[PDB]
Design a protein around this ligand. Structure first.
Ligand SMILES: [Zn+2]
Length: 257
């Protein structure tokens, strides 16, 4: 029964998931002056032209846009990664107010939201096996700020009324995740974890420097979702973000000077 409330939020997770106090937890603050440029890091290769989106699901903590990951259709490679990582789903974390919502921070700055494109390492065969490995996942994190609308987000925003409550799903085919990417693929990278229970330490994080802009109307639609099921007391799905965790024995690397 973990969540984001006063009685079950991030400060309680360690009781059920002791790895919450582990050595490589996420998110973290990205101190830009202390990140080190690593000239040997390769450009990212984001290959989403053949992506097959299938469905959108309200899982009670976020909404996931799910993809067919039974072939190499939408893959992430390069950068810090060895091998090929398949896109399984993306989701967001967002705030009740524009001044909070992101999980990672940049020099302590919080963005309005954060997009996570979740990929798993094909050498492990399936997602459930991948999360048990220290190099199992690669998550592309993209910050959202409020300003101009993001046209490529609109199809997502418009279906949210159909998945208001926990356990609702809707068909969501032919969505192109390339419309959620900023111009630049400059990034920071570090080893970390899932940011929701089970908090497994299986993620190579790749956090883009350049945020995307979304409109106030778009983020407001996020905030109309519900954490609860239909016919349960309504609680708005907002502030579904875990705060920054200690960096411990990790160095954040930058792909750019
Ligand atoms: Zn996430």
């Amino acid at each position: 029964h973990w969540g984001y409330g006063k009685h079950n939020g991030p400060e309680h997770w360690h009781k059920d998931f002791p790895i919450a106090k582990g050595e490589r937890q996420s998110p973290v603050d990205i101190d830009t002056h202390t990140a080190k440029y690593d000239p040997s890091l390769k450009p990212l290769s984001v290959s989403y032209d053949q992506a097959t989106s299938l469905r959108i699901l309200n899982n009670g903590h976020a909404f996931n846009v799910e993809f067919d990951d039974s072939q190499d259709k939408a893959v992430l490679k390069g950068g810090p990664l060895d091998g090929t990582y398949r896109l399984i789903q993306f989701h967001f974390h967002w705030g009740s107010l524009d001044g909070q919502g992101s999980e990672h921070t940049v020099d302590k700055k919080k963005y309005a939201a954060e997009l996570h494109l979740v990929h798993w390492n094909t050498k492990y065969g399936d997602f459930g096996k991948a999360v048990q490995q220290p190099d199992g996942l690669a998550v592309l994190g993209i910050f959202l700020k409020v300003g101009s609308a993001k046209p490529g987000l609109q199809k997502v925003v418009d279906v949210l009324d159909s998945i208001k409550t926990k356990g609702k799903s809707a068909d969501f085919t032919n969505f192109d995740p390339r419309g959620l990417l900023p111009e630049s693929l400059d990034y920071w990278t570090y080893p970390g974890s899932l940011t929701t229970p089970p908090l497994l330490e299986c993620v190579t994080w790749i956090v883009l420097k350049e945020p995307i802009s979304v409109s106030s109307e778009q983020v407001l639609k996020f905030r109309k979702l519900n954490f609860n099921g239909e016919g349960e007391p309504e609680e708005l799905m907002v502030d579904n973000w875990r705060p920054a965790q200690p960096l411990k024995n990790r160095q954040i690397k930058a792909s750019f000077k």
